[PDB]
């Protein structure tokens, strides 16, 4: 009864987080909710193996102690967790060593891999997602008045190649080679506050590959202001090393 990475057991809704749609429950089984010990959801993450969650480094600035954090796996509701959700304390924190906005959480016990809790697949090292590739972002963040608050949402957004995103009228030189951009130039659909650390995934042949980690933006869903994501492929070698050595 094993489950390959990147293959949801409930097919994602098409949906051609501000804007977008509410996901089918359990169609994004690698999505994590990151919480404090007695606190509510404040960031997302992506399960990448039974003991390891990838998130954004800035999600860890409230506390340098692993005991401050817990991960919720298999969830659909933001607050009223379903009976079968897995809640697991974090045992170790590893921040990316060149100060980029990406981090690994080691879980205190391995997640049980089920039809609702399945890791995402990592990309090949240094792969560059092509301009206009349609990808999906997911999370429980702010919706800015759009429907779906309190439920896991998704949005389908095209990647905008860095050379375009860095133009003066858009993000004006801010985006690094270890980041990527996604969104509609018209605005209206975006990751937002509370989505940080969660996944940006792109479908490839028969499975979803994790290509981005939700990081920052100039606001959310503004015209001419696409969201910025850490480019996961530039960190695969580092991630593999951390898992091998710890």
């Amino acid at each position: 009864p094993s489950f390959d990475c990147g293959k949801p057991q409930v097919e994602p809704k098409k949906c051609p987080v501000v804007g977008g749609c509410v996901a089918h429950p359990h169609s994004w089984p690698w999505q994590v909710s990151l919480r404090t010990r007695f606190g509510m959801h404040f960031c997302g993450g992506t399960l990448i193996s039974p003991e390891w969650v990838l998130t954004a480094a800035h999600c860890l600035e409230k506390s340098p102690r692993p005991s401050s954090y817990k991960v919720i796996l298999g969830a659909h509701q933001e607050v009223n967790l379903e009976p079968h959700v897995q809640e697991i304390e974090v045992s170790r924190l590893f921040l990316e060593p060149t100060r980029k906005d990406i981090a690994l959480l080691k879980l205190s016990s391995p997640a049980v891999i089920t039809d609702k809790v399945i890791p995402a697949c990592l990309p090949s090292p240094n792969y560059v997602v092509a301009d206009r590739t349609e990808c999906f972002i997911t999370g429980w963040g702010e919706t800015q008045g759009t429907f779906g608050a309190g439920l896991l949402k998704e949005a389908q957004l095209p990647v905008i190649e860095n050379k375009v995103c860095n133009r003066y009228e858009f993000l004006n030189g801010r985006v690094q080679s270890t980041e990527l951009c996604a969104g509609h130039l018209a605005g209206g659909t975006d990751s937002c506050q509370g989505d940080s650390g969660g996944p940006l995934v792109c479908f490839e042949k028969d499975k979803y590959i994790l290509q981005g980690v939700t990081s920052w933006g100039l606001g959310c869903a503004r015209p001419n202001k696409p969201g910025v994501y850490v480019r996961v492929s530039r960190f695969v070698t580092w991630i593999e090393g951390v898992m091998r050595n710890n």
Binding site: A56, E61, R174, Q193, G194, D195, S196
Partner: peptide
């Protein structure tokens, strides 16, 4: 103007 998308957001003057 940059804001990281945590709760609460971490924001910068640019």
């Amino acid at each position: 103007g940059r804001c990281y998308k945590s709760i609460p957001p971490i924001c910068f003057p640019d």
